[PDB]
Design a protein around this ligand. Sequence first.
Ligand SMILES: NC[C@@H]1O[C@H](O[C@H]2[C@@H](O)[C@H](O[C@@H]3[C@@H](O)[C@H](N)C[C@H](N)[C@H]3O[C@H]3O[C@H](CO)[C@@H](O)[C@H](O)[C@H]3N)O[C@@H]2CO)[C@H](N)[C@@H](O)[C@@H]1O
Ligand SMILES: [Mg+2]
Ligand SMILES: [Mg+2]
Ligand SMILES: [Mg+2]
Ligand SMILES: [Mg+2]
Ligand SMILES: [Mg+2]
Ligand SMILES: [Mg+2]
Lengths: 260, 156, 183, 150
Amino acid sequence: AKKHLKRLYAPKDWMLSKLTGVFAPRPRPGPHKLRECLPLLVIIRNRLKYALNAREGEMILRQGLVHVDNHPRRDGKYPAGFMDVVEIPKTGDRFRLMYDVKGRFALVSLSEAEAQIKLMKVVNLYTATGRVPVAVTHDGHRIRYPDPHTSIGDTIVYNVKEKKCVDLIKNRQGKAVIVTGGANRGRIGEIVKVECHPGAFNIAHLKDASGAEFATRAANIFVIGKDLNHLQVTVPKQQGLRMNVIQEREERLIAAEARK
Amino acid sequence: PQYYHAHQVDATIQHQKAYQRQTAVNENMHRSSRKHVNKSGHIRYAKKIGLGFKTPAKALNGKYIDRKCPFTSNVVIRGRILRGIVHSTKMHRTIVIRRNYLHFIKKYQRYQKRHKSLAVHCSPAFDPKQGDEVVVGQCRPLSKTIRYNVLEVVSK
Amino acid sequence: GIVRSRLHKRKITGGKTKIHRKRMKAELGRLPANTRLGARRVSPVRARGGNFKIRALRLDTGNFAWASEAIAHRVRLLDVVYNATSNELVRTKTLVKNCIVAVDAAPFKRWYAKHYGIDLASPKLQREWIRRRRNHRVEKAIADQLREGRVLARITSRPGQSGRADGILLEGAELQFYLKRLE
Amino acid sequence: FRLRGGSDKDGFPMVPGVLASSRVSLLVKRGAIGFNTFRGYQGERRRKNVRGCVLASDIALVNVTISKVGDQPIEGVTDTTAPRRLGPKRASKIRKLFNLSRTEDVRKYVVRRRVVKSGKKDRLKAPKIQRLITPRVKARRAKKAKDAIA
RNA sequence: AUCUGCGCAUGGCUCAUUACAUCAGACGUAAUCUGCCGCAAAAAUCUUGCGGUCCGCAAAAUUGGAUAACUUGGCGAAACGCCAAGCUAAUACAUGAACCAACCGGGUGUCUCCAGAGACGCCCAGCGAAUGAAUGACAAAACCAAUGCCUGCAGUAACACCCAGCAGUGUUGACUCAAUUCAUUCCGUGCGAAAGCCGGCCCGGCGUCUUUUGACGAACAACUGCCCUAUCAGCUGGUGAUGGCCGUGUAGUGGACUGCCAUGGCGUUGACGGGAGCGGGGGAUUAGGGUUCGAUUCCGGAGAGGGAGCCUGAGAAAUAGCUACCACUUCUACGGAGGGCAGCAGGCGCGCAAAUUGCCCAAU
Ligand SMILES: NC[C@@H]1O[C@H](O[C@H]2[C@@H](O)[C@H](O[C@@H]3[C@@H](O)[C@H](N)C[C@H](N)[C@H]3O[C@H]3O[C@H](CO)[C@@H](O)[C@H](O)[C@H]3N)O[C@@H]2CO)[C@H](N)[C@@H](O)[C@@H]1O
Ligand SMILES: [Mg+2]
Ligand SMILES: [Mg+2]
Ligand SMILES: [Mg+2]
Ligand SMILES: [Mg+2]
Ligand SMILES: [Mg+2]
Ligand SMILES: [Mg+2]
């Protein structure tokens, strides 16, 4: 039973500096994976500067002031990951955890109507006791009576206030996804062709808005809308478009010279 | 009219001091459904394993009673699917396959003949001779050395 | 203690394995139950996860199923008749899985008079007996030992694992298999 | 006299049951007669030297309790009595003490126990009495039946 | 202060062991256990009160016994040693909830009907578990019996009313699985609405059984890979070596193990035995090819003086846990009682060879 993380064995997307202490806050089991989450001490202290250390950081959390998906989370080690909605009523800001196109976690600011729904991907389907078919989700939810057209690769729109699955997005050819793993993580694209290969990993071929073709495993894609215009959720400021490394290097030198 | 006339003992398969039966299905049903009964006569359990492997003519219409068999048991084929050539068939219902490969040495820019031998459980659906090329699928441990189980035999 | 590892087994080359750890608790085994006939005495065993595994010592009764009729009846074990592992386990009358036992046969006859109405007259209103009994027939080797008093049967549960002596009645070629080995 | 305890010239107890006249070596569990439950961890079977129950000359102490009183009163044990230190705390166990009715209130029949200190405006210590089901508790308990069916 | 609830299985040190082992990349667990945490689930149980001797009328179920701390008396040279008695708690332990309060199903005896249909009565019908059976799909007319609508067959989900669509449709590459139906019965080794606690002015925070699954893990299996040695060429198999059949044991698979049968398996593509010693990420040098080092911060494995064996727990074969022996070893009032720095400071040795018996939780 591990209870510690070393700050070197912590994920790189958290961006904790190696010289500040040996340890990182090991996220508890919960909704999201340990490799694939951002625990609430890092959001309150390192992302947002509401807390200067971990001692000011539990003055916020243990008091019941941060809400992940409409419910107050008093754990600094609670795993918040992809598509979660983090509200704070006192400062009046609410955010969504999305991946930006460089693969890192990004806090997308939200309205009040956009902060009620979240988008969740089915990971398993089974029948529970009774004859109730429940749907297992990447965020750990077990929706008991989902839309009967739910398959495993699909996306359920959820509305975390009134816990009612308001919508369904099937996983087909004509849909748009966001990639949540691999080298292509954070990129958004239309689906082109899904190569099955039964017994092994499904490969999904994807085309971007510019036309850049790229592939991933189909367990890494997360469908978020009917097309790239009609996305069901708002995405970070690049909107899944990965610029060239040369062109994005030129633009920062131009912006820094034009600023002085 | 009250008497049923059940099936007689098939001594060709019954050799083994306990009665050889399949645990999946009951042999003794009076009005057995069309679920598991095969073409000619008797009740049989046959299963379709995964990866586009066609079950043989035996294991559906055969008479043998095999546990540890991928087509007629709870043995599931999963993980690795490999190929080898049959080396020895001297064991009872088990063959040893030989996997011959070239090992490249990065220093001396030249390959090197190596081999791995695997004990593979062989169903009575199959009779492979030495030199036959087989396709094996990984299963659970079935003995001290058996992890694989033959799925298809390619003759000669 | 008792271990279930391959550290003591020789390699397939015949080489000895040199041991560089202590025994783990996660690789243990325990002493066998050796369940016999007798009045019921069980001892639970604390397994992994805190689950309980009920050792059966001295069992005398179980739920035996008659699979053509898809019913079961709690009957009393009489004798241990044939065991495929050893004839020495018959003599000490050990209950294991798949050993052949004789059971009481009285609830099976009484059920066969209550259902199908055949003895080995009182509800004249309900002859749903006639709705059955026409298509169905009963194997002769069952009906002989059913009225003889004891029925040969096969244990289908693991008593040292579950603390139960459940079973099935021998039918078909399986009964005719074991009748030849006895007599 | 009921012989029910003992010790040696070395402080080792006389465990009732072992039927020896010597000191013997037992793997006593925790909470047994030779090994207290706070000294150890939860599994914790510790081996102690305890002494037999058969009495002998090498005994420095025997614990006895009287089951019947004889003639001579000349002893400080049967001539006096000392009060029980604590009255009852459970609400239904303090109701049986004074043989109260069902409708009767229990808060008036609590023991006083004055505490007096020199020049301190002395005071009373009463138990916070447990298992007393107020109407606020009755509404709380009847709500769990309503919301389990709802 | 003590009961109670979690934790002490992590961290930290060290690198002695160790070559079909460990370990790396990559897979498997459909062969399995899994506390804390996340989202869920939940209709079993003839209990109380009052009166009468088993019944009646009632209903916010106002349940029961014991221990600590403490007091008293203490034993003992002591001991992170102990005894006896007297008190008293619970979210400890034990007991236990009728009706409100459903649907659905099986087996079965009287009663109104017709030439089989209904009403009533009784036994049984909860989650989990065992065994057995059934599902867990599929890929032109003629005549007789029962039965369907028509006034002979147009057209048709299924079903004798209560509900005229209240599942004819689980998932996987694949299941003997998920789940459902009925047959039998679980005897403590499961299932309270904690018989729980706060707060606001009915409602809101918690806290807990069971059940179930994601998550953090555990355990096993092995695809490819690995220093030198032939002055090491045969290794294994009675007492398991390779396989097969029933079992057993396990958390589970399995020669892991009992019985029985077969005669196998490994090797000059270097087995077997011997020597060196944790394995990677990585370091040093390098045009290219390389040659070396890796006790050491991160990951994994192993150990706690050697060697066992256990308890408890979700997880240990735990060592600032227990039991024993061996080698050393400390206190004794000789009766006895203890030790385990490869934790951090230090100490003595050993060596060519490595620091402060320091301050602090301010940060991680
Ligand atoms: N060789 C390991 C295995 O031991 C098994 O048999 C072993 C046992 O019969 C027996 O082992 C016993 C053991 O049962 C018992 N419970 C404990 C005892 N220490 C062991 O004894 C063995 O070990 C010790 C120390 O090494 C030796 O002194 C002793 O001579 C040796 N026979 O001796 C045999 C080993 O020499 C099987 N033969 C086989 O599985 C395999 O040989
Ligand atoms: Mg405690
Ligand atoms: Mg090396
Ligand atoms: Mg077996
Ligand atoms: Mg380490
Ligand atoms: Mg020694
Ligand atoms: Mg030191």
